[PDB]
UniProtKB/Swiss-Prot annotation, chain A:
Localization per record: Cytoplasm; Nucleus
Domain of life of the source: Eukaryota
Primary gene name: RPT3
Protein name: 26S proteasome regulatory subunit 6B homolog
Family designation: Belongs to the AAA ATPase family.
PTMs per UniProt: N-acetylated by NAT3.
Species for this entry: Saccharomyces cerevisiae (strain ATCC 204508 / S288c) (Baker's yeast)
Protein task: The 26S proteasome is involved in the ATP-dependent degradation of ubiquitinated proteins. The regulatory (or ATPase) complex confers ATP dependency and substrate specificity to the 26S complex.
Swiss-Prot record, chain B:
Record function comment: The 26S proteasome is involved in the ATP-dependent degradation of ubiquitinated proteins. The regulatory (or ATPase) complex confers ATP dependency and substrate specificity to the 26S complex. Has ATPase activity.
Family indicated by similarity: Belongs to the AAA ATPase family.
Record keywords: ATP-binding, Cytoplasm, Isopeptide bond, Lipoprotein, Myristate, Nucleotide-binding, Nucleus, Proteasome, Ubl conjugation
GO terms assigned for molecular function: ATP binding; ATP hydrolysis activity; proteasome-activating activity
PANTHER family: 26S PROTEASOME REGULATORY SUBUNIT
Sequence position, cross-link Glycyl lysine isopeptide (Lys-Gly) (interchain with G-Cter in ubiquitin): K182, K203, K238
Membrane-traversing stretches: none
Record protein name field: 26S proteasome regulatory subunit 4 homolog
InterPro entries: 26S_Proteasome_ATPase (IPR050221), AAA+_ATPase (IPR003593), AAA_lid_3 (IPR041569), ATPase_AAA_core (IPR003959), ATPase_AAA_CS (IPR003960), NA-bd_OB-fold (IPR012340), P-loop_NTPase (IPR027417), Prot_ATP_ID_OB_2nd (IPR032501)
From Swiss-Prot, chain C:
Recorded family membership: Belongs to the AAA ATPase family.
Subcellular location: Cytoplasm; Nucleus
Functional summary from the UniProt entry: The 26S proteasome is involved in the ATP-dependent degradation of ubiquitinated proteins. The regulatory (or ATPase) complex confers ATP dependency and substrate specificity to the 26S complex.
PTM note: N-acetylated by NAT1.
Superkingdom of this protein's organism: Eukaryota
Quaternary state and interactors: May form a homodimer or a heterodimer with a related family member. Interacts with OLA1, TMA17, and UBR1.
Source lineage: Eukaryota, Fungi, Dikarya, Ascomycota, Saccharomycotina
UniProt-recorded name of the protein: 26S proteasome regulatory subunit 8 homolog
UniProt miscellaneous comment: Present with 4700 molecules/cell in log phase SD medium.
From Swiss-Prot, chain D:
Disulfide bond annotation, renumbered to this chain: none
Family indicated by similarity: Belongs to the AAA ATPase family.
Residues of the whole record sequence present: 98 to 145 of 437
Post-translational modification: N-acetylated by NAT1.
Reported function: The 26S proteasome is involved in the ATP-dependent degradation of ubiquitinated proteins. The regulatory (or ATPase) complex confers ATP dependency and substrate specificity to the 26S complex.
Species: Saccharomyces cerevisiae (strain ATCC 204508 / S288c) (Baker's yeast)
Protein name: 26S proteasome subunit RPT4
Length: 49, 385, 51, 48
């Protein structure tokens, strides 16, 4: 059981979708961190390890 | 041997005879279809078609029309048609509507629903009196109210007061009120409807009340009757969510029931049994004290009572020859028949564990230990010492 | 010939209309059955030629 | 009268450059196409 495509006017299974589809968006921004790196850190070097 | 032979004689001739007579008759019917029959069946098909949508008849308007409510969200103003008339119909009955163009084309359901199936039972109850044995005094409040006016309503007329009307089984869990309701209704000799009030709760609108209404209609046909609405506590006053609700329909259902208590004519012939955990598990809005009559208060079995209950259980239990009933009663203090039922079963489990056929007295102590376990009280000697 | 024929026969099934899905609650006396169509309401409907 | 209304959804998820999962206001989720006229640089997830 997973999401799948059906035709609009034939109402049948013509095509398949990944299950990834029709589920929560994954990072609503772009995925990665802005220019902030291990250089910018400044912590907490050990615990970051 | 001969007692077999005689029954054998009767039962073979009646069954066998009947089979041959049915077998021939299916042919004898179908060969002639000339004249009246062919005409009748043909018209009925034409007026109808395929598929036929279930409907419900809300009311009749006196001009050969009716107001109907479909399972689809719309409701509709339809014509009354076919062999089924408004004289042959009655409101609240499920009716066949033709799909394309809504008109009553017939009926085949005749007010048959999946709620109607569960409520129905016109047979005698399973338990007879003192299966249900004992809470004798409790039976000696339910019988007074429930058995007696059905049997002779005369008594009350000579007494000079209104008959009793309903009973409220309330108080302790585990006293078997859900079983007790059965016991009495056998003794009287009457029809026994049983419905669980949880199935009168619906997330569909106007459906809640339709289901309550079906009960009293049925009850009146098969009168005298005792109707058991099991768990009126389960309509209760509860709420599913308060941010998308669910707590509207609860009220409308509760209300439809308070009205037909008295309002289904002043009769003790339309008895009700309302089982409830306590009264404060119900909607607090209530009908007056005499309309429901006596409220029946279940409380814990005393020392004598739980000998009776215990005794019933252990007769059924096999291979307990090393158990003596009294000694079980000595160690234990007052408790429900519910927990006696569990102790006896936990004692089979222990003896099955060990792989030994016998069930000891010693065994039973281990079972007492398990049941009592988390009832411990040390503030008993907190006050006393 | 086998291959071209099949690709066209599956297309023919798509073009012809949908189906639904019920469960038989009871049998009624015109040789129809009371079905509850699971995602919608009830429909009383005629048997097949295989049923 | 000859221009006609239009339907609103929101891009629920990007399926492809030329295929989008939109969730219609009317009701059902759809896979739609991309017109020549709308550029895919404008399209992205979560935009109306
Ligand atoms: N009078 C009796 N004689 C024999 N067994 C009994 C008797 N009363 C109760 N019992 C036993 O105890 C069980 C529990 O009773 P029952 O299921 O009727 O409870 P209840 O009081 O309606 O509780 P709730 O508040 O959960 O509705 C019965 O199934 C039966 O095995
Ligand atoms: Mg109960």
């Amino acid at each position: 059981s997973m999401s799948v495509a059906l035709h609009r006017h034939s109402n049948a299974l013509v095509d398949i979708l990944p299950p990834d589809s029709d589920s929560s968006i994954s990072v609503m921004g772009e995925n990665e961190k802005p220019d902030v790196t291990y250089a910018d850190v400044g912590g907490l070097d050990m615990q970051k390890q | 041997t001969r007692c077999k032979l005689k029954l054998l004689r009767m039962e073979r001739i009646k069954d066998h005879l009947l089979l041959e007579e049915e077998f021939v008759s299916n042919s004898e019917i179908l060969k002639p279809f000339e004249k009246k029959q062919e005409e009748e069946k043909k018209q009925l098909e034409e007026i109808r078609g395929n598929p036929l949508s279930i409907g419900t008849l809300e009311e009749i308007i006196d001009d050969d029309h009716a107001i109907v409510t479909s399972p689809t969200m719309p409701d509709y103003y339809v014509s009354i048609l076919s062999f089924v008339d408004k004289e042959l119909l009655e409101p609240g009955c499920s009716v066949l509507l033709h799909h394309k163009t809504m008109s009553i084309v017939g009926v085949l359901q005749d007010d048959a629903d999946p709620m109607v199936s569960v409520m129905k039972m016109d047979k005698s109850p399973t338990e007879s009196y003192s299966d249900i044995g004992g809470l004798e005094s409790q039976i000696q409040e339910i019988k007074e109210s429930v058995e007696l006016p059905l049997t002779h309503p005369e008594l009350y007329e000579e007494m000079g007061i209104k008959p009793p009307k309903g009973v409220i089984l309330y108080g302790a869990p585990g006293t078997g009120k859900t079983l007790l309701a059965k016991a009495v209704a056998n003794q009287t000799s009457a029809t026994f409807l049983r419905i669980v009030g949880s199935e009168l709760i619906q997330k569909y609108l106007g459906d809640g009340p339709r289901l309550c209404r079906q009960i009293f209609k049925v009850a009146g046909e098969n009168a005298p009757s005792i109707v058991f609405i099991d768990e009126i506590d389960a309509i209760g006053t509860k709420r599913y969510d308060s941010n998308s609700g669910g707590e509207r329909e609860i009220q409308r259902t509760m209300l439809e029931l308070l009205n037909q208590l008295d309002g289904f004519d002043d009769r003790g012939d339309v008895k009700v049994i309302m089982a409830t955990n306590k009264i404060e598990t119900l909607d607090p809005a209530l009908i007056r004290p005499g309309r429901i009559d006596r409220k029946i208060l279940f409380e814990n079995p005393d020392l004598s009572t739980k000998k009776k209950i215990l005794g019933i259980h252990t007769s059924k239990m096999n291979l307990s020859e090393d158990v003596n009933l009294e000694t079980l009663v000595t160690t234990k203090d007052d408790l429900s028949g519910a927990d006696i039922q569990a102790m006896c079963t936990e004692a089979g489990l222990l003896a099955l564990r060990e792989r030994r056929m016998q069930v000891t007295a010693e065994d039973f102590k281990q079972a007492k230990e398990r049941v009592m376990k988390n009832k411990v009280e040390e503030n008993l000697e907190g006050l006393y010492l | 010939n086998d291959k071209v024929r099949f690709i066209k026969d599956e297309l023919r099934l798509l073009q012809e209309p949908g189906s639904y899905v019920g469960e038989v609650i009871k049998i009624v006396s015109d040789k129809k059955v009371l079905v509850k169509v699971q995602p919608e309401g009830k429909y009383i409907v005629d048997v097949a030629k295989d049923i | 009268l000859q221009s006609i209304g239009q339907l609103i959804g929101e891009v629920m998820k990007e399926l492809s450059e030329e295929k989008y999962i939109v969730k219609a206001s009317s009701g059902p989720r759809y896979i739609v196409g991309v017109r020549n006229s709308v550029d895919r640089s404008k399209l992205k997830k979560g935009v109306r």
